[PDB]
């Protein structure tokens, strides 16, 4: 069996312990969507500038964008999860007190 109980946990007020996917991703603040967007950019750029030398600018840009999507999305997920769970600043408790 599994349990999301954590070490050094709940340092901030938990909003929803063990957030379900499609909710922790629907919790993306305009900062997360701004972290998932800057990582995908710095990953597309290093994915285009890198590939101008071997002539692969387009496809290396695409694979840098794939890496950036995966990484920046897992980072936005880390943030919105440690926010929904009690791990991060978590000023999005108004979303629970209002809904």
């Amino acid at each position: 069996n599994t349990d999301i109980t954590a070490l050094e946990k709940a340092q901030y007020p938990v909003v929803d312990r063990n957030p379900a996917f499609t909710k922790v991703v629907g919790n993306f603040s305009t900062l997360d969507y701004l972290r998932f967007s800057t990582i995908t950019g710095i990953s597309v750029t290093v994915g285009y500038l890198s590939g101008i030398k071997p002539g692969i600018k387009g496809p290396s840009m695409v694979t840098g964008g794939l890496i950036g999507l995966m990484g920046g999305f897992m980072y936005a997920y880390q943030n919105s999860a440690g926010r929904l769970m009690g791990f991060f600043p978590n000023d999005g408790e108004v979303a629970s007190y209002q809904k």
Binding site: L31, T38, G41, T45, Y48, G65
Partner: peptide, 27 residues
């Protein structure tokens, strides 16, 4: 008054980086 694909995408993504990061060090 045009360009090629797969590079304007790169410039748009570079703009997305610096605009996005500005928003990050801004928040």
């Amino acid at each position: 008054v045009s360009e090629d694909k797969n590079r304007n995408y790169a410039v748009v993504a570079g703009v997305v980086a610096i605009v996005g990061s500005i928003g990050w060090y801004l928040k």
